[PDB]
Amino acid sequence: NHDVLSRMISEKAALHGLLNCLIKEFAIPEGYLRYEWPDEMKGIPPGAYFDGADWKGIPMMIGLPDQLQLFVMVDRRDTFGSQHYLSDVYLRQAGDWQCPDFEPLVARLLAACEHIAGRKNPELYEQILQSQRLVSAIVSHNGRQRADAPLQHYLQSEQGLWFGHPSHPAPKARLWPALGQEQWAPEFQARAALHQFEVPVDGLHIGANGLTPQQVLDGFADQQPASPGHAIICMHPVQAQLFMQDARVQQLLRDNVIRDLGQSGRVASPTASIRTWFIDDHDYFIKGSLNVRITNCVRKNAWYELESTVLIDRLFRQLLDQHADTLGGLVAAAEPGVVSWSPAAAGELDSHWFREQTGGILRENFCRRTGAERSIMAGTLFARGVDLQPMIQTFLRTHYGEALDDNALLYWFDDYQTRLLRPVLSLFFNHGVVMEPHLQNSVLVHQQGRPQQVLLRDFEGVKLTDDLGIRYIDDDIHPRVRQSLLYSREQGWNRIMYCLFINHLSETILALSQGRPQLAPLMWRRVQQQLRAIQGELKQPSPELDALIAGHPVACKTNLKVRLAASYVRLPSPW
Numbered sequence: 001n002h003d004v005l006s007r008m009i010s011e012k013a014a015l016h017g018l019l020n021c022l023i024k025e026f027a028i029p030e031g032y033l034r035y036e037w038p039d040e041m042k043g044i045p046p047g048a049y050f051d052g053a054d055w056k057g058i059p060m061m062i063g064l065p066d067q068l069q070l071f072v073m074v075d076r077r078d079t080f081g082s083q084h085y086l087s088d089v090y091l092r093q094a095g096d097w098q099c100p101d102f103e104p105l106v107a108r109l110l111a112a113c114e115h116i117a118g119r120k121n122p123e124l125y126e127q128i129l130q131s132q133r134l135v136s137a138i139v140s141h142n143g144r145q146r147a148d149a150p151l152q153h154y155l156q157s158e159q160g161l162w163f164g165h166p167s168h169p170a171p172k173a174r175l176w177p178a179l180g181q182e183q184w185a186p187e188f189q190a191r192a193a194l195h196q197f198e199v200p201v202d203g204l205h206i207g208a209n210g211l212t213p214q215q216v217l218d219g220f221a222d223q224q225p226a227s228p229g230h231a232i233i234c235m236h237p238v239q240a241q242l243f244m245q246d247a248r249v250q251q252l253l254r255d256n257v258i259r260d261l262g263q264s265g266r267v268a269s270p271t272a273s274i275r276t277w278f279i280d281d282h283d284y285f286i287k288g289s290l291n292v293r294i295t296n297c298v299r300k301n302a303w304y305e306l307e308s309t310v311l312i313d314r315l316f317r318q319l320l321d322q323h324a325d326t327l328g329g330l331v332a333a334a335e336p337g338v339v340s341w342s343p344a345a346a347g348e349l350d351s352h353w354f355r356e357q358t359g360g361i362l363r364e365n366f367c368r369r370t371g372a373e374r375s376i377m378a379g380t381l382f383a384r385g386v387d388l389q390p391m392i393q394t395f396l397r398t399h400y401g402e403a404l405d406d407n408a409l410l411y412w413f414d415d416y417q418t419r420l421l422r423p424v425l426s427l428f429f430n431h432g433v434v435m436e437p438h439l440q441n442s443v444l445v446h447q448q449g450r451p452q453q454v455l456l457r458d459f460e461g462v463k464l465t466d467d468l469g470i471r472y473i474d475d476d477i478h479p480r481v482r483q484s485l486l487y488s489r490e491q492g493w494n495r496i497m498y499c500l501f502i503n504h505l506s507e508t509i510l511a512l513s514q515g516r517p518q519l520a521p522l523m524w525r526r527v528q529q530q531l532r533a534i535q536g537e538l539k540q541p542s543p544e545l546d547a548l549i550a551g552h553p554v555a556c557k558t559n560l561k562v563r564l565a566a567s568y569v570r571l572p573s574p575w
């Protein structure tokens with residue numbers, strides 16, 4: 001009974017994430033979406049669309065080029081394809097509507113997109129299924145806690161993103177070596193001591209900002225067990241296993257150049273990014289390489305990224321220190337330290353492989369400044385709980401003392417969006433700093449539910465525009481690091497468009513306005529207005545803001561289309 005229900009919860013959640021991709025990436029842009037009732041409804045039960053009083057929202061009909069039609073009730077007409085689905089999904093061909101089981105529905109829906117895109121991916125289908133099955137397990141494990149639990153504690157926020165990226169075909173697909181899911185899954189409240197190795201100090205590459213190289217090394221691993229001339233490095237336990245499978249590491253181990261110390265490192269909890277670890281009451285997160293495909297992206301820390309990390313940290317310090325009047329209230333997590341190791345005697349390709357495997361980044365643990373009970377990762381902040389309801393509602397109800405009315409919700413949204421929009425847009429147009437301020441790179445800092453700061457993080461996806469931001473880089477920096485950092489203005493702005501409005505704010509708005517779709521036009525209008533306010537705040541010209549306020553289509557990153565082919569599409573402005 002808890003198991004059947006957990007399965008059913010995971011199937012609904014999983015399917016919604018898939019629809020999201022279908023609508024955002026195919027239906028809207030290619031023009032297959034209509035808010036219309038089918039001519040024939042045979043096959044659809046009255047209860048699907050009629051609640052006893054009125055239609056259950058608005059009919060959504062998707063006519064796919066292979067003659068597969070989709071029917072769902074939705075709560076609102078949205079240009080970003082953001083809406084609550086208020087009915088099971090119906091499919092029809094030839095006719096006759098059907099409600100297939102999870103597996104047969106996905107397959108048919110995916111074959112529809114395969115037919116549009118003109119290419120098949122059988123690997124993606126298994127990944128959709130494996131993703132859904134892990135979500136099933138996750139709800140079965142977590143689905144008895146109070147449902148806004150994720151929102152009570154930082155670590156719980158990172159562990160409580162049960163369903164993952166809300167517009168992904170397979171957000172929980174993770175392909176471990178044949179090692180199980182639970183031991184490395186945040187959603188199972190995973191802890192491990194980090195693997196550790198003793199390594200001679202001659203092969204270390206250390207980047208440091210405001211710290212000493214020893215201080216950087218200490219932040220990763222306590223260094224007491226290191227013998228003279230050696231040091232202790234850490235590594236994701238799954239990574240160490242993969243690392244030690246390579247006969248070059250076996251050689252150094254046999255020849256005693258390096259030492260496998262065991263899982264003897266600091267005991268740490270993985271965060272939503274899987275390869276980044278949280279240690280409570282420790283100054284830093286630890287972010288290591290993980291040669292494992294997480295949501296179709298191996299999380300290697302390339303050598304030139306380790307390099308860039310350090311430059312970007314340096315920049316974010318100068319800008320904050322000297323340029324605060326033009327950073328629109330920016331709050332960012334520092335990445336002040338970086339370690340990697342390769343044998344001193346190693347040639348260039350071995351050298352790069354070794355540092356890519358041993359690469360680690362220190363990220364400032366903002367909880368020290370902000371209090372763990374006051375920081376919530378934003379992705380969870382606007383996600384659904386074990387009971388498929390937005391967590392933010394009961395979360396706020398508790399902090400305010402009463403269920404938030406329309407006006408309290410609008411107030412709260414205003415306090416939130418300004419703190420997100422100002423920093424990013426000030427960085428972009430004032431400095432060429434392209435953030436990637438999507439949900440998972442963003443952390444609400446709040447005081448009794450009230451937004452104080454929206455902390456931003458992750459310097460790996462921070463870029464510098466060729467026309468303005470680039471000039472913060474020293475012309476003496478290695479060309480490969482420079483290439484790694486450099487974005488075109490249009491390239492930066494497309495990413496900023498997606499992340500800010502589509503990935504982030506659209507989700508914010510949809511969660512705060514569950515049960516109250518009428519708020520969405522009101523919240524979006526406030527975003528438009530807020531963009532206008534930022535424009536007059538700005539020290540550099542911003543023709544791209546003009547275009548967005550005016551109503552040009554918004555760039556939207558793809559998570560299903562890209563898998564089949566393409567990386568970007570365009571969705572109408574919601575205002």
Ligand SMILES: Nc1ncnc2c1ncn2[C@@H]1O[C@H](COP(=O)(O)OP(=O)(O)OP(=O)(O)O)[C@@H](O)[C@H]1O
Nearest residue numbers: 164165166272273276295299379438439440458460
């Ligand atoms: N709304 C969201 N937008 C983008 N990514 C999300 C979202 N929700 C969950 N995620 C997941 O979070 C991870 C973010 O990937 P990213 O590469 O930014 O992290 P990382 O750089 O590997 O680690 P860290 O963020 O700790 O630096 C991905 O696995 C992604 O699928």
Ligand SMILES: [Mg+2]
Nearest residue numbers: 273440441458
């Ligand atoms: Mg990130």
